[PDB]
DNA sequence: AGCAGCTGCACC
DNA sequence: AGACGCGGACATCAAGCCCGCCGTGAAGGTGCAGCTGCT
């Protein structure tokens, strides 16, 4: 909505034993008159005006700027396929990856790390993040929780696995290419390593390591 | 009031702590992950191999890594008190 | 009528990294195939020539002074035995144009500045300000800590017309002083030719060599590279080169009128005019003669400040930068 | 208050080059631009266990099956010619001037307090004393370090270099002029006013020194080592690097710089067992002890603040160790 | 003397 | 053409600098009240 009008959302939020019974406030009986100490009537006005507002449409439209994409029909057609953005999923990935890093259970699991232990738990680090700000300098102007989240879309990696893998040389100098230049490639030497790590390995849960020996190979 | 220790939590994740044949090799990773296969990369001193001295044990290995990269790489340790800093400032939150 | 949020201006007079190369006088003439000073890491032994801090002056840690080889390694550039003259190259791009903006929000402002350059160039021309460039082009300015013990500095200038030379000077750098600015025909001639680059009346690309006559052996100075080892020298395909910001720096020491006692020498031209390396800012917001309050005088009220006050906004108009709210 | 600058920076008067190399015969001395230069070579000797144990956690057995057996070491070398015995070092000194004003500061007070502090000394008294005790380095041929330990004749030749030939020539005997005494000679003093007025700022002073010491024939001479950081202290592959510019052998600036500033002959300690050389808290550290430490009131730092800042000048012996070490040059600068 | 467009403005 | 050897060894030491700083300008929607051109 319009950001100076954004104080009112404020007051529904206001938690008064929860704000989920007070923004969508259906089932109140004692906060009508709270709301209009001088009469009945002007009280149920302004109930009505809060919680009826909060559910209307209008029309629907996508005002020549947004997306519209063909979808191809099995037999022969097309459906129209307009897209919107998932702000609560996008609030809700947004919150899983600040608790599994800025959290509590992170911090403690961290510092068993740093000190080479054991703990009841591990964690997780989540790589090749990237930012994507919608408000440029006021992001009220899109969402309350465009402002809870300023910017930061914090979206996750679908890259190649070869990406930031630029090389270019000869192998002039050495004579043998698989001892030489081959383990000094950048994504050989994490697969070397980590079979060396596991061709020294219990061989009892052998239908699973032999498949992850075999893959590795 | 970020301690040596608030920051070594999230500073201990550009290192890789390897046993080879003789003791515990360190190295320095670059994307941050404890050197993995897939999504890190770890860089290799030129004979070509871990930038780490022989430590008998992984603490000794672990210290002589973590006070390398307090010592020369300080970038890593700004990103690391970056990330300090928004670890407690979401304790501050919730 | 007001200043304008952005306000760009494009660099003129760009000099190139300046490469040395090194050997012996009376070859001058064919230095073509001069072998280029390549800088060397060594290893030094020293002692603690610091002053002790608060916590390294304890009794048991005192051996610091005592025992402490100090153990540095450093980059080292030196001339061949053989070779007593460092030559210094580069060439000199003088563009023209010296009022227009790159970039500007109102151009009503835009007008107005373009109004004032116009009146200043069709009052006072480029006279003074390419006389004082052709002065640091002289004498070797460029050579900065190259200079100050040679037994003999020779410059030499030639205009590249096409591919070739058009016109050569050849000046002794240490007859023409660092400190004042006398008159000379040639000097006068390579001042009427950086006059009409500046206003525009042709292109002039210049390329400008210096023999610093040091001795066998010894130690020259390229630029040391800064870091964000403790001592880089810098060096383009092995061979070693003074950066062209320091070189930009000797031409731009132009500036004999600041609020200061201005009986010392001529300075580097800034907004805020500032010697960092001696600590002091001279030309201070708080005495009117800053570039700033000249600039919105001359431009938003009218005022308009005296003529040395004028040359010194024009010099920094020609160094660019960004000026604006 | 007047507090000192956090940033100072003083520049290096007396520049040498590195020292070069080459072997001949004596009495063919001044026919030496055709001589022939010093080679470093590698030698792979076979030593024996000759050292100091580490007996704490080795077993016995492997110690002495140790000390028995051999060891194979690589060795660089350097050595005369068998039908040379003489070596010739070669270098060129520029004594280049403007000896108290610094080439960085953040205050401009203590920068004209420094000037002003520095001219004083200059006005009151000459150059004449550090130029003495320069040019007595330069007459005897301290140049040479380990090369005229045990040399029969040591002879120091200096040349003028005026613009490209020479103009006043000095010859000295380097074993009449002794390593302790400071003495009074008359060319010794026509050298020393040469230096002086290169340091007053009223010259271009450039020197070619030349030194022939007579060792003998096919003996060892001593050129400059290398210290091999972060790249050979692993295991020990290589034993001693000799340093050698291009296929001559050669010895490094400072250590002629550290020859030329060897004056300091006032100290708190015993001052009559040597000149050492002009350091701040004046240090031997071969020897494993610091003159001038900061704990009495004697080092470069204390006199300087108490100079400058508080107009309390020391002893003219005192201002002079601080001269030399303006001229020296250094960082210097209270956080 | 009454409409539709435009611009400055208020607020978060 | 058929061959180019075995045996043993490869040091231990003390150190690794200081100081000052790190540019700014523009990158905002939504809706309402009053002015102005037009009829």
New interface residues.
Partial sequence: GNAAALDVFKFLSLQYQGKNLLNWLTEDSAEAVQALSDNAEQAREWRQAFIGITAVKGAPASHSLAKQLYFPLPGSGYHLLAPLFPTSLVHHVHALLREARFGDAAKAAREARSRQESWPHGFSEYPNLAIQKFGGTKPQNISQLNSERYGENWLLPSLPPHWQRQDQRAPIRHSSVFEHDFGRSPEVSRLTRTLQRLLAKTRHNNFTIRRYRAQLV | TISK?DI???L??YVV??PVSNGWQWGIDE????????????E?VEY?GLRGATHPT??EA?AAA?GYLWRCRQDLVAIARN?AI??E???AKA | LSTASVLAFERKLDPSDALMSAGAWAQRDASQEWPAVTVREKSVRGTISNRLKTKDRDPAKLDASIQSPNLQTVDVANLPSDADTLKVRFTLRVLGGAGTPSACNDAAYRDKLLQTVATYVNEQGFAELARRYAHNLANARFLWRNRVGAEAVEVRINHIRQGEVARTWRFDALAIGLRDFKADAELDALAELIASGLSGSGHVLLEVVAFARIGDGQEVFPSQELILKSKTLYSVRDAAAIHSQKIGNALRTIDTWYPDEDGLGPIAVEPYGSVTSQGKAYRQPKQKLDFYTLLDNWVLRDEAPAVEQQHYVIANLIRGGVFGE
């Fill in positions: 220790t070594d939590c999230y201990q994740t702590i390897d994307n941050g992950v404890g050197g993995a296969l897939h999504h890190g990369r770890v290799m070509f992984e603490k672990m973590l990330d928004e670890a400032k979401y304790r």
